[PDB]
Design a protein around this ligand. Structure first.
Ligand SMILES: [Ca+2]
Ligand SMILES: [Ca+2]
Lengths: 433, 428, 433, 433
């Protein structure tokens, strides 16, 4: 520390403002901060979960779920940046981010404040967590500085975004692209694409299906698989069906399921589709799911198949054989931060009707869209040598320095003042010559 | 050199263990070594080829092929890491790797030629024992006629730092009605894409045949070790009524053998005076690829419902296909290849492979519960020192393929400091 | 910092008292502090907005609006200086100002959980804000140190007035001028005038009006435009009307609308006014609106026109053509601070029946009115060189120093003690000679 | 203190993470932290007791008992580590541990006035405490730094684990061992065994029993004795019975009693043991009690004998003479930490229904089980000389330094910042060469 190092300051104290990442990704850019402010209402159980995407290169900050009587989560809302970055910028890179979660309210009739928080940073995407209960969170990492337990809600928790790789590319935001079309509801964007994530699902390898006839048909769930998506994705591939039985008609639908078990997206992949005897019957997958259709994080994908017969009787026995694999590409999905690190903040025993307050600052390197570029000057980052080495040193000593991704806010506040002991005006420039 | 530099030590002497790559890719990770041990049997000709993927970010180390009487190679087996990394880890980055190839038994014993080729397997123009020697112009990337008893050392030298973590082909939680159901999350970042314009108004013409007339529309060299997909469309036009088309894609192994065969369209009537579409929607999962893919070909069968003596079946075809091999362009995934060829080894003798691979790894969710991860040790000047060393690679004689005896000498010539640790023991 | 610099002390800690601005505006003046103290009552929705004019050269500090069940704002009261400066002084210049906004008290110096505060400093006048909702505030500036999000109400927010230009002229306050008149309600003042703001509205350029006869007439709103006024303004200009229809009578009224959509001032510009065929019919605008008539900040101006006929029957048709532009001059309106920077403090989730407490100090350079001048000594400011350079340095490093216009009070308090680490008695003057 | 000493840091501030114990026990191991998080509910009396085992080499942290109307304790639940260590590791050694006990229920929203805490560290096992009442606790030690009285529950208490011997062996955790068996409920473990604790109980030295016949038999309790167990144990030994009465049939049953006086385990030791007249009749004890059947700490052991007769009818006398010693071996029992030091945290006057929140961190040296060993690198501890001497010095001056095992949390927090005044980044490594 001398004066200090703008980047370290920004990284460890994001509410302080942005600084350019001192890596090798030399683009003309501009630096911006976006706040996140939410007042979430606590449900009947007094318990809930905030899912944060600490490294998300863009306006999506997280999602809030309330916990319900029956032990299921129910989606409340997305937590976003104050304004929608893709409306103004085309490219983006996350510099630093911190968020605070605390209660700001005790309801009218309530005698006493009570409530606690458990939090973890998990090195995987949302659907990869084996246990998302308040208690279960605590073992999602072995890293002591990536978990915090039973922090009082009144005091609150601070989430600090720590890097998962530098020298990351600029990410295209989901920015609208100039387009005209006959449909009012037409939407054209240029999506986060670099570093796609690909899931491959072999749904069947000569899977035999056999069942008696039914008016309305017989529906099966061929497979269900955990995947992650926040933004646009596509499904490709093909199933091949064989049969000895004449006049079978196949229906097939893909469902993308949210974290709360709810259907987010439903797409008929093939409806009413006759099968010929002694031949391959192809069922291609050509699905594109746009960002705006994804109303909450996708947590799994499943495929249902309906089998029905034209004629039909009592005992008819409908049978088919199926073979093939599908590929689910989520665009830009493997970009570190896009899906990968997840910070969960769980609360419980909070009085029903009380407010859980979220306040955050996100810092970005940004490239303006064409219209803004006319009035927004861009520059290469400030050069200071040793900024990156200092960052590397700090992170290398992360555990001995106690630099957490999840803090009791009181401890983070102490850390701020313990660190940051120099911010020294600027000695004789004022008296130099 | 002072003490030394863990990374340089790991890079130049991988059997020594792992060290974090001193680049800008700052992820919380863990460091691991995986051994490779194989005892390969020499075939009838006393000759064969080991294909190594020195930079492969994961458990695939290489493949062994024996050479046969008729001059063809025949696949033996994949050479892997001791345990399957994707079963325990989700993300991975290669730190360093070395492998030794020597004979260990007799039923002294023939010779080895080796090269590191800066391209993928199918790109090599000549893979014969002798032909290898000209795959590079780089003198430190080839070694000739090393005695098999003494053996060869393959050392993996970098092809780019600041590489992303690669997703391993890790199983993803999934339930399904089929026992043989498999769901993975694949190496995807940095795909390789081949584009094949199979036809641009290609005219086909032939007399009728019971059973049909089969043609190979195209054949093209491509590379795949892991999952890939084929997309695109052919469009067929015709003046002849009642023509039925069959089409199959074959993915062919290095040994000319069919690895994967997929019917793309079987029994498919063509209408007169219209475009007849033949879409390609193929996804090939990793587990189906039993040996490296070296080429792709498309066959088309043309038959007629009626049929007679002279019937003349004709169609016009147009369209291009795209073969995407997932994560294929990730440096190391397909790209550098080291070939170790042996010949004149006595039939029935053992060619012994022993290696160490070093990785930066991120544990899967279940292991993450008990596996602490950290940012890499900071030492400044580690990367500059690496850059200096590599910059002087040729004057230092840092080879990718060594006579083992020469590599051993190099180890002791380098690495002349490993100095205990002077007065920490007496400090205060 | 040596001892310190009175002006910097005053600027950054206004509760400390006044100091002369170290610019080139050398007037004999006197230095004063005026407190602002308000106990505002929270309405039904538990939500509201305080509009501050941090740079206002005089006694107007801000205005309080409650948010109502229906989602609309309603004016409560002006927030003023403790005493009315124009009653005692004729000229004035703002030195520094800070205000506190909080709620809730408990035995032990402790405060309760009582909702949240969002605040921004916007570099424009009140009516220029595109979004004034609690959440929308957060994007009124891109400047991270000019916005603060979801501060607990119990802890509260500190508004600090940062300069918008030095070397400003002394502003004439709205001081009463000696006058006698037959009317008890006669008022004569000398107004803030230097640096007027002028709006020009071309209300019509051959605008055709056409409508069927109506007993009582047909009223239209020719235009509506957002403008800003806190003090006196005037409307000048002329509309010209043409018509081929005989017997048309025009009425026209100007309305000045408050931030809460309420009519603040209504002035008939022309009532009962016959139009002649084939000639220009002039409608001049000669409006002067005195300060005392402006009961709350003006946010827009609109002009209504009534077209009546008197002798009209069944379905007659009334038509006229209109041409002309108006000029709205708000006196001293462009004086930096008079309208320009606005700080919004929005609260919500505040317990109904609790009181939002405002406490502030405003510091001024003042010239006494003739009666006070007889007993009020005035002087040129204390000379200290480097005071202005030091101010310029501090402001130049504003963002790295984290000098905010809106603070969580707790953070401002910390800043005060972090800064201001020298106030050193006065070493051997006491022992000198 | 220079930089500092990882071990001392871990010992005095366990929430900081683990460090290797600088003793002579040189094993290849790995270092881990496990959190403990509990939200306990306060019962009817507003009073209860948390029993901590601060030195326990494994996943058992303590047990919670509520106090009841009738003055008895009632077991609530075991307090454990976040995950079950024996599922992943085979050997273990405790490095350091701290736990926090406070009410998360804050009346008014801010106040810590919600009852009080008394706490002690007792140098013996649970059953050895003579007085376990809230008030009685205070005299369990004479050591002033091992007791704390009437700490406010809102502020809370910190339990710090201080060593009871170094150079301890690695303890085998209760890890499952590969086994197949016909019974679904079959369980095979390898238990903490090193350093057994043995109680010898001479239950009878020619004890004369005499009572009249009753259908179904006559039951006496031969003895009860205070013993301690949290994990597996076994009972060995023999009773010899003499009689003159023909056709007596003896049954024996061992009861293991919880701290709350509840039977945890009941095992029949003898049934249909027909006594032969005028001869030694042996009653061997061959009991093995597995860890898993112990649902709460065992505070005592008793043996009942049931004495029945064939054709007994009326004034038929039943009489036996008994002689013999039993030995109760609790496995690993004498391993310092396994049973020995106990920290009791008692609360009272807490409002019924409020939450007492426990949060802790436990640090371990661990050896992975065979499956984990495949992916878990193990190493000998970091060498730093003088670490152990420094620990010895610190502990030697424990009382003058005021290093407590039980703290008012506020005082512990102060201590943390008073200690730990160096954590100094790392000066010119960053600029060296
Ligand atoms: Ca770089
Ligand atoms: Ca000037």
């Amino acid at each position: 520390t001398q004066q200090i190092v703008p980047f370290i300051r920004s990284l460890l104290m994001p509410t302080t403002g942005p600084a350019s990442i001192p890596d090798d990704t030399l683009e003309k850019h501009t630096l911006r901060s976006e706040t996140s402010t939410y007042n979430l209402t606590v449900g009947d159980t007094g318990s809930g979960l905030i899912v944060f995407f600490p490294g998300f290169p863009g306006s999506i900050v997280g999602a809030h779920y309330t916990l319900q009587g029956n032990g299921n989560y129910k989606f409340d809302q997305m937590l976003l940046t104050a304004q929608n970055l893709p409306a103004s910028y085309n490219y983006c890179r996350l510099v630093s981010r911190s968020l605070t979660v605390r209660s700001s309210t005790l309801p009218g009739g309530v005698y006493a404040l009570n409530g606690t928080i458990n939090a973890v940073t998990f090195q995987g995407s949302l659907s990869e967590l084996t246990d998302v209960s308040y208690n279960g969170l605590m073992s999602a990492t072995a890293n002591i500085n990536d978990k915090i337990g039973n922090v009082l809600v009144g005091e609150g928790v601070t989430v600090l975004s720590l890097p998962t790789s530098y020298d990351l590319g600029y990410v295209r935001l989901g920015d609208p692209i100039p387009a005209i079309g006959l449909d009012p509801k037409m939407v054209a964007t240029c999506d986060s694409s670099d570093r796609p994530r690909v899931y491959t699902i072999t749904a069947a390898d000569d899977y035999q299906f056999s069942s008696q006839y039914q008016p309305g048909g017989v529906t099966i769930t061929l497979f269900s698989a955990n995947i992650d998506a926040i933004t646009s994705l596509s499904v490709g591939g093909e199933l091949v069906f064989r049969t000895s039985v004449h006049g079978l008609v196949l229906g097939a639908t893909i469902y993308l399921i949210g974290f709360d078990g709810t259907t987010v997206i439903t797409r008929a992949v093939a409806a009413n589709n006759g099968l010929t005897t002694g031949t391959d019957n192809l069922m291609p997958f050509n699905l594109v799911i746009p960002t705006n259709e994804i109303t909450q994080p996708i947590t799994s994908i499943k495929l249902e198949i309906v089998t029905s017969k034209s004629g039909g009787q009592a005992g008819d026995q409908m049978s088919w054989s199926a073979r093939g694999s599908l590929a689910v590409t989520i665009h830009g999905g493997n970009y570190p931060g896009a899906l990968r690190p997840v910070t969960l903040v769980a609360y419980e025993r909070v009085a029903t009707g009380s407010v859980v307050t979220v306040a955050g600052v996100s810092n970005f390197e940004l490239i303006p869209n064409p219209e803004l570029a006319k009035n927004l000057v861009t520059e290469y980052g400030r050069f200071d040598p040793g900024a990156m080495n200092y960052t590397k040193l700090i992170l290398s000593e992360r555990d001995r320095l106690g630099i957490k991704t999840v803090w009791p806010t009181r401890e983070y506040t102490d850390f701020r003042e313990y660190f940051m002991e120099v911010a020294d005006l600027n000695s004789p420039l004022k008296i130099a010559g």
